[PDB]
Symmetry: C4
Subunit: 114 residues, 4 copies
């Protein structure tokens, strides 16, 4: 019968742990990506308004007057922030893919017929 050594069974278990970890990182990345897409869409729309357009912003359950330039600035900052977060998550994702690649190769090498 095929005899998977205890150390390889351990690698198989860790491979599954990494897969679950990657699934989470990807879900975190996608949430950030969705928010980033929405923010960019909002900025695009606000930027198309005439400079003297009336603009209000929400502060919790409150609504106060703001201006086109201020809303644009606050949206740029939100986008800046989300992109920094997105990059960090993509770096974590890339690291996980590499660990999965390397561990998969080690398992295949260990189980390869002599």
């Amino acid at each position: 019968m095929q005899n998977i050594p205890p150390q390889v069974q351990a690698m198989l278990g860790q491979l599954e742990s990494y897969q679950q970890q990657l699934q989470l990182v990807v879900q975190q990345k996608q949430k950030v990506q969705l928010e980033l897409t929405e923010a960019k869409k909002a900025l695009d729309e606000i930027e198309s308004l005439p400079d003297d357009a009336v603009v209000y912003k929400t502060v919790g359950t409150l609504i106060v007057k703001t201006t086109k330039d201020k809303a644009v600035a606050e949206l740029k900052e939100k986008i800046e922030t989300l992109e920094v977060r997105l990059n960090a998550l993509e770096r974590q994702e890339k690291k996980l893919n590499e660990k999965l690649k390397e561990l998969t190769a080690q398992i295949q090498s260990a189980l390869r017929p002599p």
Copy 2:
């Protein structure tokens, strides 16, 4: 005893896979249908306003002035979009119902007493 052949056991398994797949498609269809109903209700209400009615729209956390005609147009587009999506999902649903019908018939034919 009743002896369900391995191939029929496979059909029974696929039948369950299709059922789970249909459940999902139906949930996707219902989410689209709910959004479509809400959009139609909103359009109905906006269309009942006097042509010179004051209208504001939300852009993310911001609020800007718009007009009755522009809001109506944007709502028509949303509805147009949702209906295209709804039809595609209904086509997927119909396909799944037919596969379930045909596979159920094959299982019954295979297990029918000689």
Copy 3:
């Protein structure tokens, strides 16, 4: 040993089914109750406004002008609706409690020592 007859085992199973069904009805009732409480709070607040107070209402992502009297009326209707729904759910709940009471009594009578 204690020998629970097959029919009593069936009653025990149905008792659990009713319990799960009641749990759901209660959750439905509580969601309706929460919405009703929020609507009443909103009506209370709007009714305290001066008759000439400026009021806007949301229609999806849009905001249009309304009046104090119109908002009050629409809130009364929402409350009317929720109360009708709440009563129906409470009637279902009462029915379930009675079935649980009666089935529990039947099980205890069936298992009572001779």
Copy 4:
């Protein structure tokens, strides 16, 4: 073999029950903390507005005019409320940590080699 007495097995079970209970209390505390942080941020922002700034508030799906001072007051009250709630939850949390500490010590003492 190691023989965990029935009473210690009971303590181990209760330890796990307390852990699950603490997990919940912590989740409740964190929800309150998030709301408190958001409210403080909103108050900070509203307080930075000029005294004559125009302010509207939402009442359900409605929007009515308010004032800077009134919004500030209502936010202070919300924060006051959340802090009272936060403290109560932190008191429950501290109690749970102490029970976990004491029960862990009892288990270790009971299982300690003679």
